[PDB]
Amino acid sequence: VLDGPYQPTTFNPPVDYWMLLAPTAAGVVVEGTNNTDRWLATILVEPNVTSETRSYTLFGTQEQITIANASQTQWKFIDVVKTTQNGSYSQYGPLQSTPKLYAVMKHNGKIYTYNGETPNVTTKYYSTTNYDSVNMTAFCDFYIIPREEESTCTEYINNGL
Ligand SMILES: CO[C@]1(C(=O)O)C[C@H](O)[C@@H](NC(C)=O)[C@H]([C@H](O)[C@H](O)CO)O1
Structure with missing residues (x-):
């Protein structure tokens, strides 16, 4: 089940595996693109x-994004996405989190991520062409968990390692 921790790297994760990310600091956690219709x-x-504007390095370039977190006590993981190379980034599906864990998975033509508020999270997805060949760059330590053991992954997202 809990395979890791692995150090930050760029690689091509297998389909139907959750990549469980364990960031320690605010900032970019993970990024991935198919170079065509999904970043x-x-x-x-x-x-x-x-509400304030911050600078982030995304896919090697400096981007200005306006962010907020209305929670007094919980972290907020935000997915920022664009659907063409020169498109603008939009924000989707926050996860408000106490444990500071997040996860992403390539599955059935989509990228899935977690969503909602710990300790009662759900998942959301984004349709992605050539979803299976998407390389991911992790900016923090990570673990690999098969989809078959999603119940374990969800437990860690909700309650921590
Ligand atoms: C086209 O419909 C979908 C999709 O991708 O299949 C449905 C999906 O539920 C929705 N997910 C969320 C979190 O809103 C997604 C995004 O709006 C879009 O991918 C962002 O670019 O759109």
């Missing part, structure tokens, strides 16, 4: 942030 980066925002 996805996940940003971790600290608790209690009123």
Whole structure:
């Protein structure tokens, strides 16, 4: 089940495996693209942030994104996505988290990520062409968990390692 921790790297994870990310600091957590119709980066925002513009390096380039976190005590993982190379980034599906864990998976023509509020999370997805060959760059330590053991992954997202 819990295979890891692996150090930050760029690689091509197998389909139907959750990549469980364990960031320690605010900032970019993971990014991945098919270079055609899907770019996805996940940003971790600290608790209690009123609307402000921050700079992030996404896919090697500096980007300005306006972020907020309305929670007093919980972290906020935000997926920032664009659907063409020169498109603007939009924000989707936050996960408000106490344990600071997140996960992403390539499955059935989509990229899945976690969503909602710990300790009662759900999942959401994004349709992605050539989903199986998407390389991911992790900016923190990570673990690999098969989809068959999603119940274990969900437990860690909700309650921590
Ligand atoms: C086209 O419909 C879908 C999709 O991709 O299959 C449905 C999906 O539920 C939705 N996910 C979320 C989190 O909203 C997704 C995004 O809006 C879009 O991918 C962002 O680019 O759109």
